[model samples]
Target: NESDKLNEEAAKNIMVGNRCEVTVGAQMARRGEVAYVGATKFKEGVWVGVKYDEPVGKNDGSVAGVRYFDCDPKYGGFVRPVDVKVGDFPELSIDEI
Candidate 1:
């Protein structure tokens, strides 16, 4: 309930096409474009919808029947603003030892 509050300032720093990275966890992360910014119907707080260069995302620019942007299925997903780091990183690689 609290996150629904407008995070006006935090959302101000991002743009629709800002290149960024998201940390999913240890040994898991991705780099992609910001497809959408601001509130989302799926959750509270300011959501950072990302269009992943890889198929690590959860959807194709949509969630629960709502489309926020456009991308290949499993290449689009939503995360919090904190997960989004606007930086110079491009897409990394996936290889085995």
Candidate 2:
């Protein structure tokens, strides 16, 4: 109902190689909810296929959070979306300084 309405227009824009980001929580894998490759193959708001090397249970003592990259169909599949030549970040773990 609501989701159907929201996807009406977006359904026309989605494609095979689109890219998206999903804030995964626990129980994502069992739900068959991939890493949110994009806004579904032909819908919006909903996510698709999973990402490579992405652990299954990070938030619930099953996986870990690590530095990551994403894929964007805008610049060919599996390619970085932005141009960050040289970024610096302090080595700080998720819950530690």
Candidate 3:
């Protein structure tokens, strides 16, 4: 039953540094896109957006965070979390703000 072609994947298409919506398990915990990207808890493994300006901070409200696309040709069509770092994350935010 052990085949080299055997592969496994997870239903959760989570990206290390990309904005994501909390649907199941804890509405808001360990996730991105909370309030203009790179909001709250910034860690190594944990995905959290950041700023790109000289005075780097989460007040600019920019959409230039660590992109985590599923596919692309620039990086050989590689997944997200590659050659990325602290940056904007516009996905996380409140309309009223």
Q: Put down candidate 1 lDDT per residue, 1-28, tens digits, no spaces.
A: 4444334555678788888888855647
**TM-score for each prediction?**
0.79, 0.27, 0.20
Of the candidates shown, which would achieve the greatest TM-score relative to the real structure?
A: 1
Pairs that collide in candidate 3 are 33-92, 36-92, 38-49, 50-87, 64-88, 65-87, 65-88, 72-77
lDDT of 2 by residue, 11-93 (tens): 34433333333333332212111232233233234433423223432232111232222433221112111111112322223
TM-score of 3: 0.20
Best by lDDT: 1
In terms of lDDT, the poorest run of 10 residues in model 2 is 77-86
**Winner by lDDT between candidate 2 and candidate 1:** 1
Which residue window of length 10 is worst by lDDT in model 1? Answer: 1-10
User: What tens digits encode model 3's per-residue C-alpha lDDT throughout 1-97?
Assistant: 2221121122123334444333223323222332222222323222323222123122333223443332222211111222232234344446795
Clashing pairs in 2: 35-50, 57-63
